[PDB]
């Protein structure tokens with residue numbers, strides 16, 4: 141797989157090459173290829189780094205290994221009647237996933253905790269992080285970090301179209317609507 | 329204190345997850361994620377990270393999100409230092425560098441003691457999330473609820489439940505902290 | 508000084524490995540510059556290459572002791588303990604343990620200030636695949652090109668031995684690559700960056716036709732590997748000699764190969780405007796020099812990759828940046 145990368149990068153340098161490595165010491169060889177550029181999204185998905193990392197965070201907070209593992213497998217909620225009370229609540233948790241989408245102009249000049257509250261209370265979307273314009277990736281910052289225009293927000297939600305309610309939100313129009321499916325309106 | 333020892337087992341095979349726990353319904357047809365040992369954080373197969381190749385394409389930043397959240401700040405700065413071959417290095421460092429201790433780690437908050445215990449008795453998850461966010465600077469991701477409530481000490485994950493979801497005094501809540 | 512019985516090489520008394528052994532502390536302390544770096548890949552069980560044959564011609568009696576380029580081999584101790592039996596009788600030789608993929612090893616050596624970094628692989632050739640054969644040889648060359656120094660990254664001159672000819676394409680990063688195209692036509696070979704073994708298949712034919720043409724180059728390459736040596740080495744006691752008589756030491760005069768840049772010196776006038784034919788005649792009369800060919804820059808209109816031109820025409824224009832291959836009497 142290291143040689144597969146070299147052959148691609150030999151043919152053409154400017155290209156995104158994502159690799160699945162197994163051992164962590166082999167990741168050092170990919171980083172020393174001259175064409176391999178971190179900046180343009182060449183991600184060496186090292187399994188041993190992540191595998192043990194997921195486990196390591198469970199030592200700090202048990203069960204976190206399977207909180208995160210479910211966020212990246214793209215699932216959908218199909219509650220069969222054979223399941224019990226505890227399983228149906230778990231299988232809803234499997235259907236949640238990470239998503240990136242831009243916040244609307246309603247969130248501009250507004251603090252993080254108040255913004256994350258509006259996403260949860262009204263829109264029903266858990267807002268984790270906001271990328272701030274070197275684009276720094278700030279996870280759950282305090283009240284000091286404000287929201288600039290066209291900020292990329294990181295959401296835990298059921299689907300991507302559910303997160304698109306953040307993009308179509310309006311303080312003038314949608315502020316009195318209880319049904320959250322009624323926020324499909326791009327017209328604000 | 330015998331079965332109450334918390335442990336997590338790495339596995340080569342997904343089908344071998346059934347042999348770990350002694351009290352559940354087992355089918356090799358059922359996938360690894362639906363099984364009782366995985367749901368409770370007792371197992372972790374490698375197969376669940378096959379989907380991570382797709383997310384790295386679509387969401388370039390979603391992969392680098394979790395590497396901050398998991399490894400505890402594995403910056404590219406480190407990866408190039410380690411590629412140079414002399415291992416880890418540092419010293420005492422300046423106060424500008426040591427101001428980078430503030431980032432959000434993950435943590436559990438039991439709803440037995442403390443100010444949040446009031447919500448565990450009667451109230452819902454939505455009421456907890458709003459109160460915790462304003463005062464403390466906390467995002468409640470999910471719950472780690474007991475399987476049996478009517479007794480083994482096996483708790484299962486519930487990632488981002490609904491607004492109106494009832495809590496118990498025995499629950500534990502996953503949280504991103506600033507402490 | 509000490510010399511071989513033939514009077515062809517710089518000899519030494521026999522040594523143990525720990526005299527010439529170094530760590531990263533001791534190697535960096537030694538102010539190494541304008542030298543050779545043998546990046547050697549080998550297991551303990553892997554068979555002998557005979558790095559003796561690499562180091563021997565570098566230690567030719569044509570060169571003075573101060574002029575010798577100090578060689579630093581980088582590999583296993585278990586492997587080099589075998590080859591030390593042959594290598595021990597050569598001055599300015601230094602062994603540093605560990606693999607040459609580690610940048611901590613190369614930065615201690617000062618690979619940025621290297622005349623030629625030779626990459627060799629002693630490991631078993633074709634035991635698995637054709638693609639995974641030169642994994643170490645390619646990754647080492649790419650590692651050195653990628654490095655940057657602060658007192659020179661891609662400007663480090665190196666030459667890579669290869670098992671497969673098709674793997675030559677992966678070395679250089681900026682050229683048109685086809686496995687249909689033979690090894691000799693490729694950009695890495697033409698610039699002296701690669702050297703496959705396959706180019707010496709033709710040497711079996713020349714040894715039949717021109718009996719003397721094979722023994723010509725053994726004088727010109729190995730630096731006077733006389734049959735006298737081969738029978739001494741067959742007797743099994745290694746290299747030997749001492750101080751030797753003035754009749755034997757008068758055999759230091761033979762023609763070595765050398766490059767002459769046309770930037771400074773008296774030959775610089777020809778590089779500006781004149782031709783190769785005008786250079787050859789002037790150099791031959793005054794200095795006793797046969798200009799064989801040129802080592803011209805590929806890009807002229809900027810990477811530092813020069814390519815070979817063996818015996819060009821009489822009317823061939825020169826540049827001030829060119830370098831000329833020459834047989835000297837110095």
Ligand SMILES: [Ca+2]
Nearest residue numbers: 215216235298
């Ligand atoms: Ca879903």
Ligand SMILES: [Ca+2]
Nearest residue numbers: 346347349350
């Ligand atoms: Ca079982």
Ligand SMILES: [Ca+2]
Nearest residue numbers: 676677679680
């Ligand atoms: Ca190439």
